[PDB]
Amino acid sequence: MATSASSHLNKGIKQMYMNLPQGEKIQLMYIWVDGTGEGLRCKTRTLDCDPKCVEELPEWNFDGSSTFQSEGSNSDMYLHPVAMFRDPFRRDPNKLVFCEVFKYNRKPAETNLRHSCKRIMDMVSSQHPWFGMEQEYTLMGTDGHPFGWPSNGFPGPQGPYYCGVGADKAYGRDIVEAHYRACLYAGIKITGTNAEVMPAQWEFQIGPCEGIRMGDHLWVARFILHRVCEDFGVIATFDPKPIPGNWNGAGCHTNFSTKAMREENGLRCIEEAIDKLSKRHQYHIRAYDPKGGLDNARRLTGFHETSNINDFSAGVANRSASIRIPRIVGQEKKGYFEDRRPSANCDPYAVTEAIVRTCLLNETGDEPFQYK
Amino acid sequence: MATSASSHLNKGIKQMYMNLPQGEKIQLMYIWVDGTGEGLRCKTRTLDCDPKCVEELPEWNFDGSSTFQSEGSNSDMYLHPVAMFRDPFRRDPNKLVFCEVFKYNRKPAETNLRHSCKRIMDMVSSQHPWFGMEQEYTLMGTDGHPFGWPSNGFPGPQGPYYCGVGADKAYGRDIVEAHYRACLYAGIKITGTNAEVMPAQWEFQIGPCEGIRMGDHLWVARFILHRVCEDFGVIATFDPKPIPGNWNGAGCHTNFSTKAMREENGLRCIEEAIDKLSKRHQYHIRAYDPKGGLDNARRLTGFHETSNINDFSAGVANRSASIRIPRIVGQEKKGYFEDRRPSANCDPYAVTEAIVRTCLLNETGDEPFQYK
Amino acid sequence: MATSASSHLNKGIKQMYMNLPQGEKIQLMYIWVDGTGEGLRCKTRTLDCDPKCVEELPEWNFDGSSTFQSEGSNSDMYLHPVAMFRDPFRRDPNKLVFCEVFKYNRKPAETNLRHSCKRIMDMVSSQHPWFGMEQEYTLMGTDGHPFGWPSNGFPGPQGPYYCGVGADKAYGRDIVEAHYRACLYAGIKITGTNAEVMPAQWEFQIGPCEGIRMGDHLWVARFILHRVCEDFGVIATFDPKPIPGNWNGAGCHTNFSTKAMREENGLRCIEEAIDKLSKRHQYHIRAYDPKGGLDNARRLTGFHETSNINDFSAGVANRSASIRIPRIVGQEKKGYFEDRRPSANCDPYAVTEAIVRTCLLNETGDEPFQYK
Amino acid sequence: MATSASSHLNKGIKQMYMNLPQGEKIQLMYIWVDGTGEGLRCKTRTLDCDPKCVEELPEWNFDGSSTFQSEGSNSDMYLHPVAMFRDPFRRDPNKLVFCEVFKYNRKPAETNLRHSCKRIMDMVSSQHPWFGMEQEYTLMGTDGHPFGWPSNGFPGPQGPYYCGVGADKAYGRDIVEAHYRACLYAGIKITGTNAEVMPAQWEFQIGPCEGIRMGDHLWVARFILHRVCEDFGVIATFDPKPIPGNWNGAGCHTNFSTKAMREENGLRCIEEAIDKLSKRHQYHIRAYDPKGGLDNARRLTGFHETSNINDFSAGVANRSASIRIPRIVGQEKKGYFEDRRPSANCDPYAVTEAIVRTCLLNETGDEPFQYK
Amino acid sequence: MATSASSHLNKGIKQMYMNLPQGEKIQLMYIWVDGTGEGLRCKTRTLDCDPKCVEELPEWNFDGSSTFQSEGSNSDMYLHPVAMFRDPFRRDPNKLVFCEVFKYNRKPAETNLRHSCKRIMDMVSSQHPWFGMEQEYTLMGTDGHPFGWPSNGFPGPQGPYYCGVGADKAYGRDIVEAHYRACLYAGIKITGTNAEVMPAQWEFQIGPCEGIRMGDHLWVARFILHRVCEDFGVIATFDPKPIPGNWNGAGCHTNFSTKAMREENGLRCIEEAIDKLSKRHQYHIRAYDPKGGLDNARRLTGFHETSNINDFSAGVANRSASIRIPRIVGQEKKGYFEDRRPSANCDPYAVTEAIVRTCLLNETGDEPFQYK
Lengths: 372, 372, 372, 372, 372
Prior knowledge:
The structure is cut from a larger assembly and holds five copies of chain A. Helices cover 27% and strands 23% of the residues of chain A. The first copy, chain A, is α+β, with helices and mostly antiparallel strands.
C-alpha cells in the first residue's frame, strides 16, 4: 500500500522546527482556484504586521500560464484578497487568505465565478438566502486505489460501513478528526461529519452560511482537507464516481432557505421554488458540475438513493428524489429544501448562483441575464 | 500479520492537530445500535453552546436503509438522546451521546429494546435492582486470526495466560489500559479487568449499575472499546466462540441483586428466584443472545468450564453451572447471585428486562406482558 | 499470501534426485480412507519384483490409534489392496495401491463402504450401471483464504470467472493442468475439466465408470489432487461452502445410466428411476454427505442453480432442479440423468450404493437390506 | 509491482508433470466468445481417439447464465466446433477447438456473428476477398498500471520505444516471443510483430486470411495471447485507449483486397471501394467496435497519427487518414487498401462483414440486408 | 523461517557442473562415526581405477583431535574400508565407503563397536540372525524450530498428521522422497517409509538385513539423510524427544528373527528369546541410547504410546508395551518380537550385539564376555 514520499519524512523534526518562536513577522498563505475549476493553489508571503481586516491585505500576482488560465505573452494574473481565516496549520497569528482572480486587464478570470455570484447576492441581500452544503469525498492512496481497501481487491459488500466504527468499518478516521479540528480552529462553520456508505468515503457539512460566504467557506474547507491529506500522505478526491459499479458515488447536497421559507407558512415559498426548478432542470444540470454533465452522469444512474439525471422528481422525505423536503420541515410548515443533484466536485458559486437566479429572480431561458 | 491501514498513519500528526485550541464550538458524537443488534454506529455534529443536561440535546435523523432497519420509501429514522458522557477521545467539553432509535411514525424501532426496558425499570424503581455485567472480548487482527498468535499457528496450551504478565503471556495489554483509562475518564462505572484464559482474550466488568443505566453504560463501553481498537488497528470481537476447539469462549456473566437481597437476610430470596429461572430456562436462553440460541451453543459445550446447552444448575462455589451464588454472599446471607448463562454478544437490555420480568414481576409464560 | 514451507524447497534438487535409476525394487504407496470419511492417508513400501496383477500385492497393517478410527486395546488395522494404478509422481514401475480397511477380526471397518458397495454391484453386474461424478473443489492458501484472492479482501463480483481465461480470471490453472495430466498418466478415466463460477474453484468430471471402479477412480483422483497440491504448496478443499454468502458452493453431480436406459426407448427406465428417487429422497439426502446432513444443507439453498435440500424437483434441461434430464437424452429418448444433490465432500461409495439400491433393486424403507 | 499469484507457483513442478507420457487419451479445449463480445471462455474434455478433421468433433453444451448469454429457465447453450488448431500449450495430439454458440432452439446467439459472416463470405466466395488485421495490445500488471512502468509514474516521453531494443525500451518481449512461437506452432498465419509507440504496447499482424478464416484465426490468436499472459502473470488488454492523454492508442488496421484488386490495374477497384466507404462511414464506425462507437471515440481524436472519428479522409501513404493506400500499391496500381478505423477490441467478424457488405455487395442504408 | 545459506545458492549452476563428463578418475567418500557416537564425518579422495571389491580400497588416516577421538600428541587415526555402496550424490562409478576407525596402535577406537559386532556375528553366523530397524527422525530448520511449524508457535493438535497427505498435513515430503530414491539407488535395503504422528517427523524402515550388514546399512542410511538434508538446507535430528510437551518423540523399533524362528513352529524360539530379554533390563536401557537413560528417559514416559522406563511388558498388540509380538505372529505360530524400546539415536551395533548376546549366546550378568 503506497503512501506519498512526503508522509515518510520524520514528522518529529517538523514538530521540532514548528515549536520555535516565530517572532513578529506573519505568514499569509494566499489560496485561489485554478483554471480547471476544481484544483486549489496556494503560496505564502511574509507581512510585517498583523492585518486587522481583509481590506488591509495587499494584492498579489502569479503566473497564469502555469495554471491553465492565460497565454504566454500576458501571463500575469492578479490575486485580490476576499476572505480571511485563522491558519490552523501555522497557528496564530498566521492567516489563510482566500482571493479572487483577475486577468491582466482587470476583468474577471474565466473561473472567477465569485464576482457574478457577488452581484447576484447583492441584488438579493434583503431576503437573506441561507445555504448549507454537504461535501462528500473519498480518501485515496497515491496509487489511485481507495485508501484502506485491500490491494488489487474490494472490501466486503456495502452495508456495515455507513457511520461505522471499528478497524474493519472506518478507513482513515484520523484524517476526518484532523480536518474537523482544523476547520473549527480556522473558524469555518463546519456543522458535522459522518462516514458514508462506501468504505473510505466521508461527508462533512458546512452551513448555514449566508450568501457569498458559502463559497468562501466551502473552498477553504476543501483546501484544508487537501492540506490535511498532504500531511498524512493520502489524497482527497471529489470525483462523483471514484469506483465504477455498485459503489456509492459522491454528491454535494445543497439545503436552501429564504426568510420567507423560514417564517410561518413558508412552505408555499418552498413549493414555488421547487416548481421553478422544475422549469429549468436542464439549465441547473448544466450548472451543477464543471464539465457540464460529463461528470454528474456516472453517479446519478437512478439507483443507490440518487435521482436520475434526466427526470425531475419530488417528494416529502424521499431520499431518492432530485429534491427532498425534510419531514420536519413539512410538519412545521417552515424551513429549507434539499437539492440532491449537485456533484461532489461542483463549484459552489455556480450552484448558489443558479439556485438564486431560478428561485428568487424568476429567471427563464438557457442563459443567465446580465444586470446593470 | 495485518494491522489496519489507518493504524500506520503518523499519529504524531494527529496529535499535532488535536492540540489546536478548539474554541467555543462543541462536538457531539451520536452513537446508536444498528439493525443487527451487535454493531454500533456513530456520527458527529457541531453545537454552538455547552449543554447543561441531557434534555437540552437535539433530536437527529439518519438513513435507516443503510443500517438494515428500514425500507427505501421511508428510510429516515430518528435519534432521541438518552445518555450523555464525557468524550475521552476529544476531551472536555465534547461528549458522547447514546440515543434511542425511533421509526418514521415515532414508534420504537425493532432493536430499540431500551424503551421497554426503561418502562419495566420505572415499574420496579422502588426495589432498586442492581446489575453487574462481566464483558469478555477477544482482540483480533484484521486478517481474522487472534492478535499476537503465531502466523497460521497456535500458542502453547492454556494455563499460563490467565492474568498473565510477560511478552509471551499477555497480548495487547496496551488496548486494555487505554480502554480502561478512557472508560474512567468518560464516567463509566467500570469496576475491573483481567486477562482471560485464552491469549488475547480480556474481560472488563461494569457495575454495580442500577436499572436502565446498565444498558446505557454497557453499550457505551463497547463503543469505547471499538474506538480504542480502531486507533490501534485491531478488532474487538464479542463472538461467543471466536476460535473453535479447546479455546475458551466468551460470556457475559450477570450479577443480580435487589434492595431486599442486600439487606439483612435474603439468601432465601436467591434460592426461590433460582427455582423460577430453572423452570424457564429455554425462555432465558432465548433472551440471552441475538441469533435465537445457535450462537451460545458453540460455547456452552460443557467440557471447557460451561453448562450444557440445556440444563439449569445452582450451587455455592462451582464454575460448572449456569448460576453461581458467591461464597461470601452465602456466608453473610445477603448479596447477589451470578447468572453465568448470557453470551458475550448479548443485548444488555434484553438480559436485564428478562431477569426483572422473571424475578421481580413474577411473570410466567413465553411472551412478556403488556402493561398499561 | 502464505504458501507452505515445503513448496519453497528447491525443486531442482528434487529433480536431480528423481532422475537416478531406481533399479529393480518398486515403491508401492498404500492409500486408504481415514475415520473421518474425508481425509486420505498413505505410506509406501518396497517390493522386490514387478507385480503383474492386483492379487499379487501383499496385505499390510498400520496403527489405528492416531488416524481416528479405533481406540485402546486393539489398534492394528489391515489394508487389503483393491485397486492398482500407475504412479504419476514416481513414474513406472512404481504404483499407487488403493486399499480397503479391515478390523483385527477381518470384519469391514465402519468406513469401509467399498465392501458393501462391491456386494451391491456384484448383485447388479448384469445390468451394467454406469456413473459419472463431477467433483468440484476450491484451491486455498495455507492461511485459509482462497488462493489468489486479494489479501483480506474479495475479487470482483461473480460473472467473468466461470471457464475464464486470463490472469485476472483463472487462479491456479497450473494446478488443474498438473492434476489432469497426472490422472491421464495414472489411468483414471477423467473426461474433462472447467473453471467454476467462484475464482479458485474448479470442477473435474470422472466417468462413465462401471460400478465399484467409479468409487475406486474417484477416491484415487482426490488423492492425486492433494498430492499435486502438496507439491505446489496449496490446499484443495472439498467443503460444500468454503466462503459463506453469495459465492458458489461445490457439488458432486452424478450422471447415472443403465444398459436398458442407453438402448432404444430407454427414457422410460430413466423416468422409472426418477420416480424411485422421488420415493427415497430423504434416504438419498442422508446418504450424500459425511457430517450427516450438516454439510449439504449449507449448499442446497435453492439459489445459484442448486435444488432445495427438502424438495425433490425434476425438470428437463432444468439446471436448478434436484434431477435434470439432459436435453439430448430427452430428444433421443435414451441416456442418463443427472442427480444434482450430492455434496462435493460426499463418499462416492455411499451415493452409488444408495442410488443403485433405490433405482435398480426397487428397495424401500430407511435401512439397507441384508442379502445372502 | 503485483503479478498474479498463479505466476509465482513453481513452474518446474508444472514442467515435471507435463513431461509425463499422456497415453492414448486426447484433451480438447473448447473456446467460445462470451456475452460481452470481448471475453473468451474455455473448457476441456477428453476424447478417446485423434480426430482427423473438424467435422469429427462432438458438439458440447455449457451453462449460459454464467456468461451473460441466456436466462435461468433455459440456461443450456451449445458449442458447435467450427475450427481446429494444434494445441501449443499441451503439444500434439491435443487440440484447441474454436466453436460457434447456439441457443436451445439452435438459433445463433446474439454474439454469434460468425454465422452471418460465413453466409456473406459464401455469397462472395468467387471473388476471394483477402483480409489482414493488425491487432495492437497493451501488457498490464494485475494492479492496473501498464507492465514495466514505474510504480505510480510514467516512463520517458514517447519516441525511443517504437521497435525498441534494450531493457529500458521494450517491456515484455518474452511474452511476444512466446506468443509468436505458439501461434506458429498452432498453425495461425501470424505474419509479424513490432513494438508500438507506447512502452509495453505491441502489435501482431494476422493474415492474409481468406474470408471467414480471419475471424477464426484472430479470435484464437487472442486466446493464445491471454493464455500466454496467464502463464506469465500479466494481462493483455485490447482497450483502444488504455492510458488517457498523450500515450498512443491501440487500433486494429485492416488490409483488404479482392482478386480484381490484386490483378493488373486493380487501383480502380480500390478507389471504388473507398468511394463506397465514404457513403457508409457512419454505419461502419458503429460496426467497428462492440459498443457502437463509444470505445472508438476515445482513440480516434485526430492526434497521434489517428483519423478523426467523424470525418472520412483518404490519401496515398497518409498514416493519419481514415483509409490509407500504401505507396507501393499506388505505384504498382494493384494490391490492397488499409482501413485504419477499427478499434483494437473490435470483433473481426463485424469488421469483415461491414467491409464486404459495403465494398462488394454495393449495399446502402443503415441495416444489413437479409438474403435468401 | 530460516534455512541455511548453502540452500540459497543457485542449484542450476551446480547442475551445470555435475553434467560434465567426469572421465576415468573416481571419487571415494570415506564415512566414519565420530567420537560422540551420533555424528558422521566424511572426506573424499580420488582413485585412478574402478575398485572391483572392498579389499582393493586403501586404508586412510585422519586427525582424531578434531573429532573428539584422540589426544593432541598422537592424534592420527586410521580408516579401514569395510563397506562400499554406490554414490547417489555423485553417480556411478563413484562410491560411498563406510569405514571402521582404529587407533594409532591398531586397537579399536572407543566408539568402533563394529569390530566386536563382527566378532559376535561371526560367532553366531550359522543361525542367520535377521534384523530390521525402523529409524524415526525429525526435520528441523536451521533456527532450531521444527521445520514447517509456525514461527514461535505450534501447529494443530496431534491426529491429522500420521501418514498425512496435503500441504497442511505433511511437511517436507520432498526430502523423504529424495532420501528414499537415493537409498534405493545406493543399494540400501530400505523396505518402506511413512509419516509419523508429529508433523515434520518421519520414519523409514531398513531390513531385513543379516547380522553386521544391518549396522552398515543403517549408519549409511543416516549419512544419506544428512546429505540430502544438506542439499535442502534443513537438519535431520534423531534427538529422542524433538520438541518438549505433548509432541511424540522418535524411536528405532527393532524386528528380530533367527533361522529357527522363521521355520515351522519357530514361535517357541521367539518365546525363549523374549524370556531372555526379560532377564536383562537396565543393561538394555543403558545400551539403547548414546548416554544411558538421560536422552532415552525423555521418551519412554509410557504416556504417548511408550514403555515407562522401569519394567518390561511383553504383549500381543499392546502398542504401549516393551516387547510387542505382532498379532500375525500370535495366530501363525511364527514371526518376530519388536523390541519397541531402543531410541532413535541408538547405535545399531550396540542394539544388535546386546540382543544376540542375550537371546542366542545365553549370556548372563551385566558385562559382556570376552571370547577367544
